[PDB]
Amino acid sequence: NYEHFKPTGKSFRTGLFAVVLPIALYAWALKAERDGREEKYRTGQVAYKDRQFKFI
Amino acid sequence: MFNNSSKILFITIMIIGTLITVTSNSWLGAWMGLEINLLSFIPLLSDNNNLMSTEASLKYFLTQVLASTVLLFSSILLMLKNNMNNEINESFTSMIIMSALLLKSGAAPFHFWFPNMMEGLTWMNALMLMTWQKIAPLMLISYLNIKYLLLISVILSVIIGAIGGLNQTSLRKLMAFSSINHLGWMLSSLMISESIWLIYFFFYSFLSFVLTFMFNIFKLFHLNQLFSWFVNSKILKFTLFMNFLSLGGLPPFLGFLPKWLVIQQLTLCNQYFMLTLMMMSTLITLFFYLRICYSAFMMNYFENNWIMKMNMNSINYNMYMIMTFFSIFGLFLISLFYFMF
Amino acid sequence: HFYVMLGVIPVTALVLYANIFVGPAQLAEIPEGYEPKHWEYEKHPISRFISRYILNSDQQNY
Amino acid sequence: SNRIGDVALLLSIAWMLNYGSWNYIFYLEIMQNEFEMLMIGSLVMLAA
Amino acid sequence: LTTEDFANPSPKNWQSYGFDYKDQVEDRKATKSTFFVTVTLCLVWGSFYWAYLPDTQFRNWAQREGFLELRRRELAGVDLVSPNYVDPASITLPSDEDLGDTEIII
Amino acid sequence: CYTDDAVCRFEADQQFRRDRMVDNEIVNILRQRFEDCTLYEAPDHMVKCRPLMDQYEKATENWFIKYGDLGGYANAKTAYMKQKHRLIWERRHGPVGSGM
Amino acid sequence: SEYFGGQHLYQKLSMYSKTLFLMHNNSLKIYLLLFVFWILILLILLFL
Amino acid sequence: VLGLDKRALWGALPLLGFAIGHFLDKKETERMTMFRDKSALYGRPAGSEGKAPSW
Amino acid sequence: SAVNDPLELLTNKGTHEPSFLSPIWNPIACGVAGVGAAIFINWGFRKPVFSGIQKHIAFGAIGVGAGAYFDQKRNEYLAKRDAVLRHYIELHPDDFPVKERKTYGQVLESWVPVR
Amino acid sequence: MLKIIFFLLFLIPFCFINNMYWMVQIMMFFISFIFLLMNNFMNYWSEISYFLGCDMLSYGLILLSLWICSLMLLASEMINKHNNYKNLFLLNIIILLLLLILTFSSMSLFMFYLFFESSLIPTLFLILGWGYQPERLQAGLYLLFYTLLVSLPMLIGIFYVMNKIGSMNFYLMNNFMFNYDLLYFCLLCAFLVKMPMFLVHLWLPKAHVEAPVSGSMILAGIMLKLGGYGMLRVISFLQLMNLKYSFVWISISLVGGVLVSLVCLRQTDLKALIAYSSVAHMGIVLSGLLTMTYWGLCGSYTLMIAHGLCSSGLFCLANVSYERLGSRSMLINKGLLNFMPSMTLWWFLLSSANMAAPPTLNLLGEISLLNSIVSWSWISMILLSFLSFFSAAYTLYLYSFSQHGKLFSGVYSFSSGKIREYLLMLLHWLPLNLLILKSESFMLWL
Ligand SMILES: CCCCCCCCCCCCCC
Numbered sequence A: 001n002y003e004h005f006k007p008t009g010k011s012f013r014t015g016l017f018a019v020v021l022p023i024a025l026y027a028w029a030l031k032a033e034r035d036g037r038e039e040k041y042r043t044g045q046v047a048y049k050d051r052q053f054k055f056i
Numbered sequence B: 001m002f003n004n005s006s007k008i009l010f011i012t013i014m015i016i017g018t019l020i021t022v023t024s025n026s027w028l029g030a031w032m033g034l035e036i037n038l039l040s041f042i043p044l045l046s047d048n049n050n051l052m053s054t055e056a057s058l059k060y061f062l063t064q065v066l067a068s069t070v071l072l073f074s075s076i077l078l079m080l081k082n083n084m085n086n087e088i089n090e091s092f093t094s095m096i097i098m099s100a101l102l103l104k105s106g107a108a109p110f111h112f113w114f115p116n117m118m119e120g121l122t123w124m125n126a127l128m129l130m131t132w133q134k135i136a137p138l139m140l141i142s143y144l145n146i147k148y149l150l151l152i153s154v155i156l157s158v159i160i161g162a163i164g165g166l167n168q169t170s171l172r173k174l175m176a177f178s179s180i181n182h183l184g185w186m187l188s189s190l191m192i193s194e195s196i197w198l199i200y201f202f203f204y205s206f207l208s209f210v211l212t213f214m215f216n217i218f219k220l221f222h223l224n225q226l227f228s229w230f231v232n233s234k235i236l237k238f239t240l241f242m243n244f245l246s247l248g249g250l251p252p253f254l255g256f257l258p259k260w261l262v263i264q265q266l267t268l269c270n271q272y273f274m275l276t277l278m279m280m281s282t283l284i285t286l287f288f289y290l291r292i293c294y295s296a297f298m299m300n301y302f303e304n305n306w307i308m309k310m311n312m313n314s315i316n317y318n319m320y321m322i323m324t325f326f327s328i329f330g331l332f333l334i335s336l337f338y339f340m341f
Numbered sequence C: 001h002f003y004v005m006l007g008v009i010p011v012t013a014l015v016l017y018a019n020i021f022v023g024p025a026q027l028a029e030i031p032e033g034y035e036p037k038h039w040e041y042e043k044h045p046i047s048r049f050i051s052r053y054i055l056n057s058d059q060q061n062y
Numbered sequence D: 001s002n003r004i005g006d007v008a009l010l011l012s013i014a015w016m017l018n019y020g021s022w023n024y025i026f027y028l029e030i031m032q033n034e035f036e037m038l039m040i041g042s043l044v045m046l047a048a
Numbered sequence E: 001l002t003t004e005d006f007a008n009p010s011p012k013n014w015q016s017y018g019f020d021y022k023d024q025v026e027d028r029k030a031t032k033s034t035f036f037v038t039v040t041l042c043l044v045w046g047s048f049y050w051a052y053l054p055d056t057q058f059r060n061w062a063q064r065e066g067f068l069e070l071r072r073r074e075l076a077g078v079d080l081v082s083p084n085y086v087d088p089a090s091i092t093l094p095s096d097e098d099l100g101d102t103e104i105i106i
Numbered sequence F: 001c002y003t004d005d006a007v008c009r010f011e012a013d014q015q016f017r018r019d020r021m022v023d024n025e026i027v028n029i030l031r032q033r034f035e036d037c038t039l040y041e042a043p044d045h046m047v048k049c050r051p052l053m054d055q056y057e058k059a060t061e062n063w064f065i066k067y068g069d070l071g072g073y074a075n076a077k078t079a080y081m082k083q084k085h086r087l088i089w090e091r092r093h094g095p096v097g098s099g100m
Numbered sequence G: 001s002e003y004f005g006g007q008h009l010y011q012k013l014s015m016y017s018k019t020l021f022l023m024h025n026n027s028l029k030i031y032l033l034l035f036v037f038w039i040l041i042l043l044i045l046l047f048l
Numbered sequence H: 001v002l003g004l005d006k007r008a009l010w011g012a013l014p015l016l017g018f019a020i021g022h023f024l025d026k027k028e029t030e031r032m033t034m035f036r037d038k039s040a041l042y043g044r045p046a047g048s049e050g051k052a053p054s055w
Numbered sequence I: 001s002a003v004n005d006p007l008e009l010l011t012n013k014g015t016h017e018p019s020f021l022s023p024i025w026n027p028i029a030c031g032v033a034g035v036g037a038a039i040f041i042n043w044g045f046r047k048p049v050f051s052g053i054q055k056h057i058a059f060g061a062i063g064v065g066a067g068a069y070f071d072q073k074r075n076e077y078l079a080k081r082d083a084v085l086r087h088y089i090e091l092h093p094d095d096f097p098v099k100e101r102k103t104y105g106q107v108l109e110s111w112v113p114v115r
Numbered sequence J: 001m002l003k004i005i006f007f008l009l010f011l012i013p014f015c016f017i018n019n020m021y022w023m024v025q026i027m028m029f030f031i032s033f034i035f036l037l038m039n040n041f042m043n044y045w046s047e048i049s050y051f052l053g054c055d056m057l058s059y060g061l062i063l064l065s066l067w068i069c070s071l072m073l074l075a076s077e078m079i080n081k082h083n084n085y086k087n088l089f090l091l092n093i094i095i096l097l098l099l100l101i102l103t104f105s106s107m108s109l110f111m112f113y114l115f116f117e118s119s120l121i122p123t124l125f126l127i128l129g130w131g132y133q134p135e136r137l138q139a140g141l142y143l144l145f146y147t148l149l150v151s152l153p154m155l156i157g158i159f160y161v162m163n164k165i166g167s168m169n170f171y172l173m174n175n176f177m178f179n180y181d182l183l184y185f186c187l188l189c190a191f192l193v194k195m196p197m198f199l200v201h202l203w204l205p206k207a208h209v210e211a212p213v214s215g216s217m218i219l220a221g222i223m224l225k226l227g228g229y230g231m232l233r234v235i236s237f238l239q240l241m242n243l244k245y246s247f248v249w250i251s252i253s254l255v256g257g258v259l260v261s262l263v264c265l266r267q268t269d270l271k272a273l274i275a276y277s278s279v280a281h282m283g284i285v286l287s288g289l290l291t292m293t294y295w296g297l298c299g300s301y302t303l304m305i306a307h308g309l310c311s312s313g314l315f316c317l318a319n320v321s322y323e324r325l326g327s328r329s330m331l332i333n334k335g336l337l338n339f340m341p342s343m344t345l346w347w348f349l350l351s352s353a354n355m356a357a358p359p360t361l362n363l364l365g366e367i368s369l370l371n372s373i374v375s376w377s378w379i380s381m382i383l384l385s386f387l388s389f390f391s392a393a394y395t396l397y398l399y400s401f402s403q404h405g406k407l408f409s410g411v412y413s414f415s416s417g418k419i420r421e422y423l424l425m426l427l428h429w430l431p432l433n434l435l436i437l438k439s440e441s442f443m444l445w446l
């Protein structure tokens, strides 16, 4: 099928809002949540007994 | 060599002139050795029953005579300014010496004579052109400590010798473009370690000297002559075509070892970017090696019907299969070697 | 089913012979003057046979 | 319609490990006022 | 063909098993030996060998040592899990002037 | 252990792994003690099992203080660096969870 | 992904090899003139 | 019922290779005899070297 | 050893016993390579594989002799290499000094926690 | 592992003796039997002899590779009856088994790299020699170049690590740690392409559809596990750069596996749908590796072994129906229950194994790899639930549309199932349901 594919703004828009854009927002959400939780964890705002996911 | 004892005499004066060149402690003795080597190599490569061999000899003559006169010119200028045989600090006349040596060696961007002349040759004179005639200019490059000009030559040689070999379906010009690509790996090793260059040159000449014998015996001057080449067992053609994966640098063959020692010595000397540029180059060289390897890896071919028996020389095919064994199972001799310590 | 039974029947005979006729080991305290061997840390006689004869010790690998 | 329940049970198992054993019957009455255990119960409720 | 052929089938006409389609003798050896070296050896005798494997990974010994360390630590005032890797008197504790600006990670 | 020594880092890493295993069935045995308290005191597990739950929570807190956040590749070096950084933090900034 | 990958890389390398094959279609005097120009460049900077 | 015919006599050569590999493993066990009893976890102190080695 | 002296690091005390394959691996591998090369020659000329055993015996003897000779040359090359390294360390003791061994009890590295 | 390697090295001359195909299969299953009796390995490196040794990780990977190659000889009978270079095929299988054992038994990383690149050549030989379509040349070139383009700068990374540390041994390299971005990208991108990330998968369905079953099983069952075992070795000393740069790979490998799972719902080729099924579950493996939790590594190794077994078993079924129906698709192979009723039991027992099957090792690998992703962040819950829901949406469509409904009514008469095929399907499924009784040998490699 690839030999009938041309760079067109419809195909670029399909490849943008289909694949790249959910990857971008999902990576941004993961980075923002982990940065906030890492700042909370490294500042010292939570204790060792009141901490989620102790693997125990 | 073939059909005359005077060609054996020309080979003797060829070895004498090259060994006069590389042993010279002055640029003038190296220059006159290049004159002896040129004198020896004009009559081999000349044949009056071939219309293109004389044109190839003329192209070689004009390229080497222009490159030898520039080499003597900048040698005389180096003696004029810095009166010893070498130079204390690097200047432009050392770059002119290196450029005149790069025209002899066939590296890019002075590469253009080399595959345009290799269409006019046989296979044995091709092997003498791209192995022994690269002894004398490459060993004289070692006396010059220039990094930018050598680095430009390395990058241009590995870019062009990979890209340029895709278009030609003739095996002589394709193998000439492969020799341009393997010249860049030699020149990249020339400014880190002369011994590692000698090892890459010896194994490259070994793989060239075993790939010439498959083409010289059966007279394979084209890509589809490989597809029409008759063997009495298709497993034999499958094994004989593994030397192209060896020359492509694929482990566990023998030709992974010299590329690997160049990569190890380059990374110890803290060069990483041009090494990465030479990683992308050798994939394209392995790609146009695989178009030869189409002729044996599919195990069954629509072949021509009239030919039924294959013919070969006795001593040439006996010496060919000693080295084809060592071009496949040559990594079992990794414990025997002691140069690399 | 033939080859499963042809496997299981000597396995069942060996397991019954080990569990009935040679028996398991009994736990006991280590004597002060005795250094135990590498197969004496295991309860079952099949495990003792496997550790003593077939498998290497943990000390040798360590 | 059963696979949604299967993956809700998978996420409940993934949350249940804060206190070690997935045998919930020894922890439900202890942790009826814990946010992680209500989220376990919500995933189990979605699966059921 | 007739109904007497089907009622009394021929030994020489054999439905071939999956291994060899040339000789009937080669199937009746390959099926037996391939079922011996896979089902009997690897999946029954190998599973019996694995069932009575020793504690190569220390798990039963770790359970026994867990009961013994809970036996000794409940006898004394030492807590059941030690919070520290070593004793804090062996910790050198470099001063704040010696550290300067160094990243401290918890 | 020294920096360049590898014969003793193996022994220290192996005893660190074995102590991690020993503390793992310490916490596992304490959890089974709490569960057996729950089954045996079937209508009255809110009174009898509260001290056992207190020892289990203290054991989980001490286990996370010693072994927590090290990851899959927990050497004896990594737990010692964790303990040094934790003792530095309780020297300077006070106990973990108070602030600063 | 095939536009940023293997098939379009093959098309680009085939176009570059077709262009570089036209570089080799001239006589030897063009390349020797290029070498003479490069030597003249290195000799002008010897004055400078 | 086994299915090994007269061509199964070729299989003594891989068992010979098994014996060769086992002999080389035993020779490498003999080569690694340093720290046989000097390890801090399984090694008895001095004055008790008269007993047999453990492996 | 409380210090890492390069002289004590490079001097062969003799506690490293060589392996079983250490004196014998190169001649048997080169003999196997010679026998396989003669087999490969006989296969490409459409002979039987074990037809000419004179070539097999000659190639094996050439392989064993070359393997033993180049193994000896390798051993003297490595001995001279370590002698060169030792003599260069004793020639310039200022650039290769005696460094004090520093335990982990005096080192504060940065541990990397996952969470 | 000298006894196994010398066993296969003297199993090499059985290829040149005629009518010995099943004898090589019998002795390779004997190798698997002996390697079942060699289990005594723990965490560190045991059975050390001439740079060769294994831990529990490498023990399970060698055992999986030995089981897959013996099954591969059992799977490939079309080589035997047509005499389609069975000696060369047997020699390729034995040499590739030596190379995979040698790249798994490596105590230093450079033997792993060297035999890892050596293992690309007999797989390329299998692709270029024993396929059935004209796009064999498109397949092995994609495999070779997508592996080599990222595996060549990792050699520069290896020599950079060697100069910095001075050795390639996996325990001595565990002590150090590096804060270089390009070293991280070299040591990761080769494993990120070799086991398929969503952005770099391309070579996988091209290599799988074209490849012969003895050539698709070694790409599905193993040789994607080289790119997982490489990260299981490499992420130990690059933890800080992994915490800097994990989130882009976790986001890509969790969006893929949903997009990849939606791809399989819109495809008709039977071999291509399992080819994309290898991407989605090892998307879970790749997401669980780069979270450095202990459960993540243990469940990742479990899902590597179990997913290799079930994917090789699923590619076993796609060649049984291919050789009877001439060409495979969803449209031709619709409803094979009325043709082969006894094959349908293995069809469901291995297609259910591709999703969460209840007593198999696939579920136990999946139930502990979800633990690390959920404990990593709560944002990942949304794109995991869609991932597993669409995973069992596509992998039940395979069995559903191929094994139920009206017949094609255009097919000709073909042979029925044989003793070889049911035995081949049994040894892919019952190891998935029997190694759960000792799952600690496939969970705990640490
Ligand atoms: C004195 C007690 C003897 C017990 C013997 C038990 C033998 C068990 C053998 C297990 C391994 C079998 C491998 C085929």
Ligand SMILES: CCCCCCCCCCCCCC
Residues within 6 Å of the ligand: I023, I024, I027, I028, I031, I032, I035, I060, I064, I068
């Ligand atoms: C085909 C067999 C070749 C090898 C024969 C044995 C050679 C032994 C090594 C060479 C002699 C070493 C003396 C120290």
Ligand SMILES: CCCCCCCCCCCC
Residues within 6 Å of the ligand: H006, H007, H009, H010, H012, H013, H016
């Ligand atoms: C056809 C006869 C096969 C058995 C005799 C020849 C092979 C002997 C091998 C001996 C290995 C030790």
Ligand SMILES: CCCCCCCC
Residues within 6 Å of the ligand: H020, H023, I028
């Ligand atoms: C590779 C070695 C083969 C010969 C071993 C002999 C042992 C006595």
